[PDB]
Amino acid sequence: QINTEYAVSLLEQLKLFYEQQLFTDIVLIVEGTEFPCHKMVLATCSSYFRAMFMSGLSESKQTHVHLRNVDAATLQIIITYAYTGNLAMNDSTVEQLYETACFLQVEDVLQRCREYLIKKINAENCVRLLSFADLFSCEELKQSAKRMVEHKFTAVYHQDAFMQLSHDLLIDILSSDNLNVEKEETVREAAMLWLEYNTESRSQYLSSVLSQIRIDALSEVTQRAWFQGLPPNDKSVVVQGLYKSMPKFFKPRLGMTKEEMMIFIEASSENPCSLYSSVCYSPQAEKVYKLCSPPADLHKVGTVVTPDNDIYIAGGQVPLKQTAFRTVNCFYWFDAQQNTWFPKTPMLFVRIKPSLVCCEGYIYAIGGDSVGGELNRRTVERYDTEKDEWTMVSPLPCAWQWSAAVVVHDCIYVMTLNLMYCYFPRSDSWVEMAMRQTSRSFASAAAFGDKIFYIGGLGSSVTVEIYDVNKNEWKMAANIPAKRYSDPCVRAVVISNSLCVFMRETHLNERAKYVTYQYDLELDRWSLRQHISERVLWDLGRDFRCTVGKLYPSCLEESPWKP
Amino acid sequence: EHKFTAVYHQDAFMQLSHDLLIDILSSDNLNVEKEETVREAAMLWLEYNTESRSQYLSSVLSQIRIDALSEVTQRAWFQGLPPNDKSVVVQGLYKSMPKFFKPRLGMTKEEMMIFIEASSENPCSLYSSVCYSPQAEKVYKLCSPPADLHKVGTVV
Amino acid sequence: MDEKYVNSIWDLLKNAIQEIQRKNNSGLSFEELYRNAYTMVLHKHGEKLYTGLREVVTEHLINKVREDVLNSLNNNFLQTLNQAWNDHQTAMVMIRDILMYMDRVYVQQNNVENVYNLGLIIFRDQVVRYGCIRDHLRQTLLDMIARERKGEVVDRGAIRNACQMLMILGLEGRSVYEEDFEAPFLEMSAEFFQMESQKFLAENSAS
C-alpha cells in the first residue's frame, strides 16, 4: 500500500505552501478577491480545472483567470478542502456548496454534500430540496425527495415553494402511486390552488394536470371554478374539457389503504434460525402481515406512533461480536411504504426498553436503564423532529424501573409501581400526582381521551386502576373476566375510538389463546369485540410490545406460516 | 420416465393405449442422454403392430419430432408401408418444419459431486447437503432427506 | 430566463465552437468556455444544446473534411485523411471537455452516448462510411498492401496509423474496423495466396 506517513507529510507541506504562498503561479480572480493557489491541487480535486489548464486556450496560459458565477466563501472552502481534506459543512451553505461543486465538477465534495442532504431531508425543506434536485441532476436526491415530498406534502400540502415548481415535476408528483392521502379530494384542491397561482401561465398545463387525476373529480365541482378563472372568450378550453374526460378510468390510489392495525415487535421467530421477529395483526382483514426485522435485530427497544402516524425506534441492544449483548443508542425510523428502517440521528446515552412518547412533535424517551447510572440516572431526553437532534429535559425527580409513560393534555405522564409525576413541557418541571393504592409493575397504559387506564401489573393480573386528569384521582372500575388458573398477558391500546385490550391467556398444559375485548367506558365492562382464531396468529412470546398505528396492506406481504 | 428411458424393451410396454403412450413420449421428463433411443423405442413399438395403428404411427411420428424424424424413419417406413398409400406420404412429409423443435431434459446429466453435512448458514439447520459442478463451476444445493437427522452414508 | 437570453448564449457558444474548429482555440479563452457552459446548463436546455452541437459538428464535417478528402483523393489521400482525423481529435479534446461537463448530467439522466462518442459516430457516418470515400479507401489500401506483398517496400507507419484510427472509430471494440478493413483484406489474401500456391506447386518441388 501507499505509505500514509509520506502522504500526510506531503499534504501538510502543500498546505503550508498554500498558506505561505511560495509556489503559487495561478490566481483565481472572483469578484475582486485574490485566490493564489496551484494547478496540481486544482487538477487533482476538480475535474473542471484539469480541463481549464490542459486545454491550450487564452485563460489556460493566462496566469490570471476571472472565474465568474461563483461565490467567494464557497470557492475558499473548496480550495481549503482540496488542500487539507477538511470539509466543514453547516446547515445553510450546503446549497451554494452543491452549486459550486456541480459547476466545478468535483466528485468528492459532490458526494459529501449529497450525503449531507440525504441526511438533512425533512418536512420544511422537502419541496425546496426536490426543486434543487430537479435543477441539478441527482437521481439519489431526486428519489429520496420524491418519497419524502410525497408523504409529508400529501400530509401537509401548504408549502410556499410548492407554487414555484416546474410542470414536469408536478406531473411526476401528482401522477405517482406513492401519495399518502386519506382522500382523493385534497390532491384535487392542491392542484386547483397550484393552477390558480397564475391564469395564463397555467392554461397550457391545465390540460395535462387533469390528465393525471382520476375522472371521479373531473366531472364534479371544481370544473365551473376553472371556467370562472378562464381567460375571456377562450373557446379552446371549455369545450375541450367538456368532451375530454372519456379516458383515465377511475383507479383508487394507494394512500386510501391505511387501516388501524396493531403493530407487534420482538415476536417469537417462526423460523428457529432467527432470534425475534416482528409481525402485525389486522383487526379488519383478520390476517397477520409480516413486518421487517428490527435494524440489526435490535432487541429491547421502544415504539411510538406520532399523531402524524409515524413509527420510530430508540435504544435497544445488539449481540456483541452463551450470553453476549451490548447496548447501543442508535435511532431508526420506519418507512411505511418501502418496508425498511431508515437510520436517524442516534441518541446521547444507550437505553434498554425505553418509553417513547410523542408530544408537541417531540419524541420523549423516559428512562430505560441508561449506562450513565449517575446521581440523576433518571435523566430523560426529547428529540427534535424539525432539526433532527436530541435535547435534554428536566430530570425525573425519582428513579424508577420498569415504568410506562403516556401523553395526555399536552403533558407527559410517566407511571411506576405506585408513584406518578406529570411533566410540563411549557415550564420544564415535574409536579406530584395522585398515589396508587396497589403496588403493581410490568404493565402498560393506554391514553384514551383525557383518562389514563393502567391495565394489569404485578405474571400480570386483571386489576384495572383508572386515573382522571381533570379529577386527579385513581379509581377502580372492574376486573377483566378471564379463565382461572391462567396467566393472561394484558396489552392496553386505543382503537376505533374505544379502549380495547389485547390479552393473551395460557391455561395449564394448554397452548396460548389470543382474544381481544372491548371495554365499555360507561358500563365499566369488557365486552367481547372479536376472538382471534389460532389458524392465523401463532405464539408471539412474552417480551413483545403492541402499539396503535396505520399500515398499507399492499406494500406489506402476508407471512407464510402454518396455523 | 426414470427407468423405461434406460430399459425401453419391456414386454408389457408394447401393449399400451395411444393416449398413455402419447403422454409418456410427449413429456419432457425422459431420462435419456441421447435422442435416438426414444426414436428406436417408438419404432419398435410401431414395428410389432403395423397396418393396425398407422394413424397412431403418424401421431407418434409427429410426437418424436424432427430431431429424430430426419434420421432413418422415412426409409424404414418406405420398407414397411402398406401398398397403394399416397396421402400417407403427404402427411408424413409435413412433419419436417413445424411443431417447435426444442431441447429435451434428459441430456442434462452433468457429472457432479453430491456433498452432505455442510456448514449451514441457518442456525436452525445443523447441517446441509450441497453439490458442486466440475464443468459449470457452480455450487448447487439439495434438500435434507429427514431435515433433522444427520450422520448418514451415501452410495451411488 | 427568457428565450432570447438562452438563444444568444447558444449563438455565442456555437460561434466559439466554430472558431475552435478553425484551429483558432489558442485565441479563444477557456474562461469564456466554462462560463458559456455554466450559462448553457443553467436553464437545463441540454436537449437543445445537444441537438445544436450535433448539427454544428455534422455541418462542419460535411463542409470541410468531406470536401477536402474528395478534393485530394489521389494526392496524399491517406495522409490528408490522417491529418483531418488528427485535427478532429485535437478539436474534440476541448469540445469533449466542455460538453463532457455537460455530459455528466446529460447522459446520467437522458441515457445517451457521450459527446466524444457522438463525434466519433458522426465522423464514421460522414467520412469513413461515405458512399464514395469508403470504396476509394478500400481500393487504395488493397492496392498498396498488394504492392507491398509483391516485393517492393512502401510506407508502413501510415497503414498502422490508419488501422489505429479505424480501431478507435469502432468506439465499442472491433465491430466496424474488422468489417471495413479485415474482411476485404481477407478476400485479397483468399486470391493472392491461392494463385501463389498454384504457381509454387508447379514451378518447384517438395524440397
Side-chain angles (χ1 to χ4, degrees), chain A residues 473-482 488-532:
Chain A
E473 48 87 19
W474 286 90
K475 64 174 184 178
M476 303 286 296
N479 61 90
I480 303 100
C489 181
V490 304
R491 290 293 188 271
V493 80
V494 176
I495 171 176
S496 301
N497 201 20
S498 179
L499 178 68
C500 298
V501 282
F502 179 80
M503 297 183 176
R504 167 188 52 87
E505 66 279 355
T506 302
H507 308 74
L508 71 97
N509 205 20
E510 299 291 336
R511 312 301 97 179
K513 184 60 182 61
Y514 288 90
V515 58
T516 180
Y517 292 88
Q518 192 271 340
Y519 164 72
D520 204 317
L521 182 59
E522 52 269 0
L523 295 188
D524 303 2
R525 180 182 54 88
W526 283 258
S527 59
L528 176 58
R529 177 182 177 181
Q530 192 269 347
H531 46 66
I532 292 94

Side-chain angles (χ1 to χ4, degrees), chain A residues 440-442 456-462 488-490 542:
Chain A
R440 294 296 173 264
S441 180
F442 297 92
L458 173 57
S460 180
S461 61
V462 293
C489 181
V490 304
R542 291 294 181 179

Side-chain angles (χ1 to χ4, degrees), chain B residues 35-36 38-44 46-47 57 60-62 64-81 92-93 95-96:
Chain B
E35 45 84 23
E36 51 258 75
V38 285
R39 182 259 306 177
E40 56 90 20
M43 288 296 105
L44 63 91
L46 290 160
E47 302 275 42
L57 207 165
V60 165
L61 208 74
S62 78
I64 201 80
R65 101 176 81 178
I66 75 171
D67 73 323
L69 268 200
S70 307
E71 284 198 33
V72 85
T73 59
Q74 311 101 303
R75 291 87 202 169
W77 172 52
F78 295 153
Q79 151 86 34
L81 48 80
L93 187 62
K95 284 130 188 224
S96 64

Side-chain angles (χ1 to χ4, degrees), chain A residues 391-408:
Chain A
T391 304
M392 290 289 299
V393 294
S394 179
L396 209 180
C398 183
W400 296 337
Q401 46 274 358
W402 306 294
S403 177
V406 292
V407 54
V408 181

Side-chain angles (χ1 to χ4, degrees), chain A residues 47-48 51-52 56 102-103 105 133-139 142, chain C residues 25-30 44 93-94 97 100-102 104-106 108-109:
Chain A
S47 180
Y48 158 75
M52 187 75 172
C102 183
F103 177 79
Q105 295 290 340
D134 209 330
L135 193 66
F136 302 143
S137 292
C138 210
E139 259 309 300
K142 192 179 310 271
Chain C
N25 21 81
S26 27
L28 219 117
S29 170
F30 213 88
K44 275 227 113 122
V93 164
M94 304 156 295
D97 293 331
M100 176 267 304
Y101 154 70
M102 171 261 195
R104 298 292 182 85
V105 308
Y106 198 75
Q108 264 53 80
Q109 268 55 231

